[PDB]
A paper describes a structure:
Here, we present the structure of the [name] T4aP secretin [name] to ~2.7 Å using a fully functional, His-tagged allele that we express and purify from the native bacterium. Once assembled, VcPilQ forms a 56-strand beta barrel. In VcPilQ, a 32 Å alpha helix follows the N0 domain. Following the end of this helix, the protein chain changes direction (~104° angle) as the coil flows into the N3 domain. In our VcPilQ structure, the inner channel distance between the corresponding glycine (G439) alpha carbons is about 8 nm.
The T4aP machinery extends and retracts the T4aP through the [name] outer membrane pore.
Numbering used by the authors:
A (entry chain G): 365 to 571
B (entry chain K): 469 to 520
C (entry chain F): 417 to 468
D (entry chain K): 365 to 416
């Protein structure tokens, strides 16, 4: 009879509180309630397991004259607030495009020397700047000079990434018992993998 | 530019832009633009098509 | 526990500078010349820059 | 009799909650409710497929 407010202390009731914290987690819960002798006992399990894949391909092309610069673009132009000269603001435009920029050169033994820029940018989140806000950009860029045979492909570069995370929180001695331990612990595990590649292939137009 | 052997040299710019969303700039807003652009110099016979 | 691996690659010509990048560009509020603001972009990228 | 507020815990009721999240998704739902022995069971399917 000691405490005043009595509907149910749902949070003070629980002994072990290690629920799977997600929005798509599925659960199931069992109970034994007498209320004659007073005894009550509750047990809930919850779980989640998901998985994902993705793949993107993009390929621009150009035709041009030997020793002559060419470009092709597709994207957006972000208006930024101010550009500064001697005194005042010429507000300007940053680019977020998928672009190819190239200057070629033909050599005697059936080969090309290429001065290459290839980018793929997008519009990102809107961050906080001073008392204002502005838009950020997500980029991928590669710039090189290479030497490649007439009609075949070379890989200019790439990036590979991998990551693994594990975590446990348990009860100091019980969360290690061989089969019962799963009643005294929360377990989390995550793995990711990513891969990017860039190819190029030139060709001389033989009329 | 017209050349002797029935051919043209073209200095080309072709674009197709549109008005995009209105983004946030400082304490203000402004309008963004969506673009497609190609600029080249090519050499093409008198009355036929090429893909740029 | 945790473990991360990242590996960029490049091919280039002898004595010639090359770079490869992946990340974001943060717009910062103002850059100062003789009088006014050219607001600029700082980089937060995973990058390789090399001359062999 | 333990909880105070009782109309129906529609969110605490469900075991598996993996509904197709869209605005044009179509569903269908079956039920078996006794209320004499207490047993209740619900099952709903939902789907969507579009093309452009």
């Amino acid at each position: 009879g000691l405490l005043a407010d009595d509907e149910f202390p749902v949070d003070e009731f629980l002994n072990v509180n290690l629920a799977s914290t997600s929005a798509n987690a599925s659960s199931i819960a069992f109970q034994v309630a007498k209320l004659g002798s007073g005894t009550l006992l509750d047990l809930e399990l919850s779980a989640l397991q998901n998985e994902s894949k993705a793949e993107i391909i993009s390929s621009p092309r150009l035709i041009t004259t030997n020793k002559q610069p060419a470009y092709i673009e597709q994207g957006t132009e972000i208006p930024y607030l101010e550009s500064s000269s001697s005194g005042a603001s010429t507000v300007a435009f940053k680019k977020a495009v998928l672009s190819l920029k190239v200057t070629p050169q033909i050599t005697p033994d059936n080969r090309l020397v290429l001065d290459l820029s290839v980018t793929q940018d997008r519009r990102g989140e809107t961050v906080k700047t001073g008392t204002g806000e502005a838009v950020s950009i997500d980029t991928q860029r590669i710039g090189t000079q290479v030497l490649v045979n007439n009609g075949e492909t070379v890989v200019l570069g790439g990036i590979f990434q991998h990551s693994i995370n594990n975590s446990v929180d348990k009860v100091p001695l019980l969360g290690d018992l061989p089969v019962l331990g799963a009643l005294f612990r929360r377990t989390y595990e995550q793995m990711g993998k990513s891969e990017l590649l860039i190819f190029v292939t030139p060709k001389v137009v033989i009329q």
